[PDB]
Amino acid sequence: GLRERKKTRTREAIRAATYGLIRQQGYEATTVEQIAERAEVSPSTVLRYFPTREDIVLTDEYDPVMAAELAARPAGEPWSDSLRHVLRKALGLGAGEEAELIRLRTRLLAEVPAVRARMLENMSDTGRMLARAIADRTGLDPDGLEVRIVSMSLVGGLMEVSRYWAEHDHEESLAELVDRALDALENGLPA
Amino acid sequence: GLRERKKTRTREAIRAATYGLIRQQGYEATTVEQIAERAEVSPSTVLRYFPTREDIVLTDEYDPVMAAELAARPAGEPWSDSLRHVLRKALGLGAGEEAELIRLRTRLLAEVPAVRARMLENMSDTGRMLARAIADRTGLDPDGLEVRIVSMSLVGGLMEVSRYWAEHDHEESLAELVDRALDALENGLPA
Q: Cα(A52)–Cα(A64) distance, rounded to whole angstroms?
């Protein structure tokens, strides 16, 4: 019954271990086994919480995290600037070494189709939390089509940018690519 | 050396079997084993060609099929009507019992997250053929960001529609949902 917070505290320690190990030693050098030890937790506890290591990577999950970022604007802010806010943050733009960890997840997205594969299977099976937050601030039907289209389209926008940054870093920053992405999502189709 | 066409002819017979069995007996009643026999082919031939049954479902693959549909417009047709064409076809709108088979794949997309899961993993790992065909007819950079955003956004549009149709068929046809989808993709973000 203080079980909903031994639960999260252990999820978080596994999250922190795996991130910690990836910085030092790269993704594939990171074994679940190595992860338990560092989280000071059994291997079957990791598994039970995170079926694959991709799942640990995608714990700060996108949809719920971009949704909350958007609900909590909460500024009577135009749409364009809420969308700039949430997409920059979701990709790891900003001060914070919390931004720094997010940026690493942005690179994994590009380097690991296993990670990009999973974020992709993740990527249907919901959340509709982001869709529901777009509806609040546009007033649209929360369960309607339009908002699911926009939401898929932002989630797959963030994924295209992160793939594109990894191949074009020498010539474009993450930041200007985000600007390009937002522009295309807001104005692109035309005709 | 008539190996590139025993190859396709066998791919096609497996495709036809599996479609055939699904109509009669539903998806899960369809075993790879049942599939070999009907295709009159070994079980390990199916596997070697299609790792999972989801792969057989997604053989007429979306990206290459929507790309070719778009390249081959080839009508100096406005953008909006090429996009209406290709999305209607991709979902199974049109005369043809070829349309009828496509519609079944549209229903599987909604009913089988295993199928929707796989079309989703499929769904990063490329094709960029659709992206390349959007570039021809907009003149955009074929390897640029903008065209990858638009393409992801149409592919995930078609997937949202097909999910939405399955829950809203009694009140909306596939066809008017496509119209809703195209409208949102063309005009929606606004603000």
A: 20
